[PDB]
Amino acid sequence: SSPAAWNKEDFPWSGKVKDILQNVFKLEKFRPLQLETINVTMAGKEVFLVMPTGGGKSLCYQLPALCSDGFTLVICPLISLMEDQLMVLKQLGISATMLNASSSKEHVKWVHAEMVNKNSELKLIYVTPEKIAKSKMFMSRLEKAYEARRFTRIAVDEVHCCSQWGHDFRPDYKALGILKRQFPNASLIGLTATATNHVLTDAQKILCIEKCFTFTASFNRPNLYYEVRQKPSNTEDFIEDIVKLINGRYKGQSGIIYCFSQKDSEQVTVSLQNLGIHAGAYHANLEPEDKTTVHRKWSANEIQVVVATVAFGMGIDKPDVRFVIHHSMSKSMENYYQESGRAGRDDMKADCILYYGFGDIFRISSMVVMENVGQQKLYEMVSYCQNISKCRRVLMAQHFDEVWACNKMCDNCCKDSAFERKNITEYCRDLIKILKQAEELNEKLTPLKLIDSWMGKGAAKLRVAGVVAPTLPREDLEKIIAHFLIQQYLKEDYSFTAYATISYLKIGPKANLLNNEAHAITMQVTK
Numbered sequence: 001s002s003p004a005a006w007n008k009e010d011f012p013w014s015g016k017v018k019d020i021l022q023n024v025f026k027l028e029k030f031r032p033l034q035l036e037t038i039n040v041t042m043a044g045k046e047v048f049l050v051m052p053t054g055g056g057k058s059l060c061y062q063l064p065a066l067c068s069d070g071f072t073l074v075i076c077p078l079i080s081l082m083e084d085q086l087m088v089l090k091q092l093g094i095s096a097t098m099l100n101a102s103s104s105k106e107h108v109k110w111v112h113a114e115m116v117n118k119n120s121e122l123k124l125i126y127v128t129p130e131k132i133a134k135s136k137m138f139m140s141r142l143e144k145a146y147e148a149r150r151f152t153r154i155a156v157d158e159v160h161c162c163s164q165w166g167h168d169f170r171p172d173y174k175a176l177g178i179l180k181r182q183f184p185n186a187s188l189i190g191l192t193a194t195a196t197n198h199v200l201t202d203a204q205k206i207l208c209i210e211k212c213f214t215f216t217a218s219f220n221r222p223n224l225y226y227e228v229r230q231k232p233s234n235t236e237d238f239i240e241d242i243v244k245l246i247n248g249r250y251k252g253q254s255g256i257i258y259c260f261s262q263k264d265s266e267q268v269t270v271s272l273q274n275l276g277i278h279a280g281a282y283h284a285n286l287e288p289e290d291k292t293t294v295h296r297k298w299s300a301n302e303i304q305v306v307v308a309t310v311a312f313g314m315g316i317d318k319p320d321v322r323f324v325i326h327h328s329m330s331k332s333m334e335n336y337y338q339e340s341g342r343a344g345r346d347d348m349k350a351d352c353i354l355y356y357g358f359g360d361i362f363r364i365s366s367m368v369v370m371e372n373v374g375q376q377k378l379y380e381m382v383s384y385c386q387n388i389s390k391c392r393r394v395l396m397a398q399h400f401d402e403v404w405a406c407n408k409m410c411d412n413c414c415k416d417s418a419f420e421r422k423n424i425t426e427y428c429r430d431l432i433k434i435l436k437q438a439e440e441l442n443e444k445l446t447p448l449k450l451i452d453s454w455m456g457k458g459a460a461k462l463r464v465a466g467v468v469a470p471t472l473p474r475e476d477l478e479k480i481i482a483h484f485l486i487q488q489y490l491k492e493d494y495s496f497t498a499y500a501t502i503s504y505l506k507i508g509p510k511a512n513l514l515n516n517e518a519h520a521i522t523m524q525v526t527k
């Protein structure tokens with residue numbers, strides 16, 4: 001059966017479920033798929049829930065824990081993710097606990113007693129997968145609790161960690177198949193955002209489950225406005241553009257500015273502070289006292305904007321973030337989706353504005369050089385930024401492999417423009433004449449040196465007679481070059497230097513298509 005057969009408040013527990021939702025959790029209604037998942041697990045069946053980060057996966061096992069006898073075991077990979085949860089539950093008046101590496105002899109002792117104590121109101125126990133594999137004592141206590149009918153539910157957070165395709169894999173998650181082998185009458189719930197069908201199909205094998213429900217929430221957030229603007233060359237013109245949004249459309253409202261590095265974040269904060277904005281900086285090197293100060297003041301609306309690196313992300317659930325601005329592009333669409341998805345968690349209209357700058361390609365490419373598919377993921381993001389016709393949601397859905405109604409909620413859906421295919425081939429030939437000459441001279445060209453030569457500027461040795469750049473503005477030339485880069489007519493070449501990795505361009509793998517003199521390279525332009 002499908003999720004629809006389960007979107008129902010017909011069950012013996014439904015009265016109790018609505019009541020605990022509204023009066024213990026202080027939530028009013030269920031988000032998509034939350035009711036259905038709760039129903040399945042309450043019915044004592046196995047279910048995987050696939051739902052975006054910050055969407056409310058946890059509810060789907062915390063709420064059942066309260067509607068059942070005994071405790072729910074929660075397997076969770078990071079102590080910080082566990083500590084996130086326990087803070088929230090204590091504040092709700094819920095008895096929950098965790099066991100840990102650095103766990104007290106007194107505390108471990110107390111937990112063990114509670115598990116077999118028939119009168120316990122302790123309803124959730126969080127543990128790391130190390131506890132299942134490397135604690136004989138804890139497994140026997142689970143066995144006793146299971147036999148005493150006090151252990152009826154297993155939640156495995158981050159269930160994708162089970163698989164050999166899932167890029168946050170953890171060896172101890174391979175041991176977790178012991179849970180359903182030993183405790184077949186404990187129902188299991190698997191939660192993840194990052195779920196491919198063959199990573200899930202595999203985790204289902206690792207966990208020794210079959211059969212299983214799989215519920216997938218759409219990663220579409222209908223209230224989010226998605227935009228890409230040209231990033232300005234001048235860094236002071238860029239600040240002025242930001243301050244005009246913040247003091248105009250986002251006047252009084254909460255938001256985030258995401259930055260490439262810690263220096264960018266520190267710079268942008270100061271820049272805005274001097275211009276009146278209540279801006280605060282958040283990066284990893286910050287004294288953790290100040291990490292909290294900034295989060296505290298931002299969540300409490302004293303600071304209007306956090307100017308941050310990706311390090312501001314884990315466990316952000318502030319509901320009224322009205323804008324996420326990307327000062328630089330993310331490393332990948334997956335990072336973009338997740339970072340911008342921190343906007344508008346109250347489901348009211350919120351803005352996602354990405355500033356695309358040519359230079360950022362190379363700062364990021366260089367930075368992710370050691371990653372298998374780093375460059376390939378960056379280029380997908382660049383291709384999003386380069387798109388001027390296609391719906392932003394359509395481009396995102398192509399990436400998550402979802403079947404997929406924007407209703408004018410992205411910059412490209414609101415355009416009235418027409419478009420056409422401009423043949424830019426000769427421009428590619430011309431830049432390859434420049435690079436060919438450069439190698440015949442044993443010269444390395446950074447992207448700046450390529451653009452300068454094309455434009456008839458820069459060092460005179462690096463110029464090729466009869467090559468004229470068009471009188472298009474620079475960002476247009478930059479876009480033509482980014483196009484050939486991601487299309488691989490050109491390619492990057494890295495150099496590792498004492499302190500930094502830097503990028504140079506070269507004739508890339510697809511330049512041999514230009515041996516065909518009829519070959520055509522086209523780029524979409526406005527009519």
Ligand SMILES: Nc1ncnc2c1ncn2[C@@H]1O[C@H](COP(=O)(O)OP(=O)(O)O)[C@@H](O)[C@H]1O
Nearest residue numbers: 027029030031052053054055056057058059317
């Ligand atoms: N039905 C709901 N209505 C409103 N807020 C919710 C609902 N369900 C969950 N939340 C909130 O959403 C936020 C993120 O939930 P969480 O379970 O931590 O997300 P995930 O594990 O999917 O990242 C939390 O602040 C949580 O309290």
Ligand SMILES: [Cl-]
Nearest residue numbers: 052053193338
């Ligand atoms: Cl996500």
Ligand SMILES: [Cl-]
Nearest residue numbers: 299316317318
């Ligand atoms: Cl928050």
Ligand SMILES: [Cl-]
Nearest residue numbers: 419420421524
């Ligand atoms: Cl077209």
Ligand SMILES: [Cl-]
Nearest residue numbers: 522523524525
């Ligand atoms: Cl195109």
Ligand SMILES: [Mg+2]
Nearest residue numbers: 054057058157
């Ligand atoms: Mg979660």
Ligand SMILES: [Zn+2]
Nearest residue numbers: 391406410413
């Ligand atoms: Zn759209």
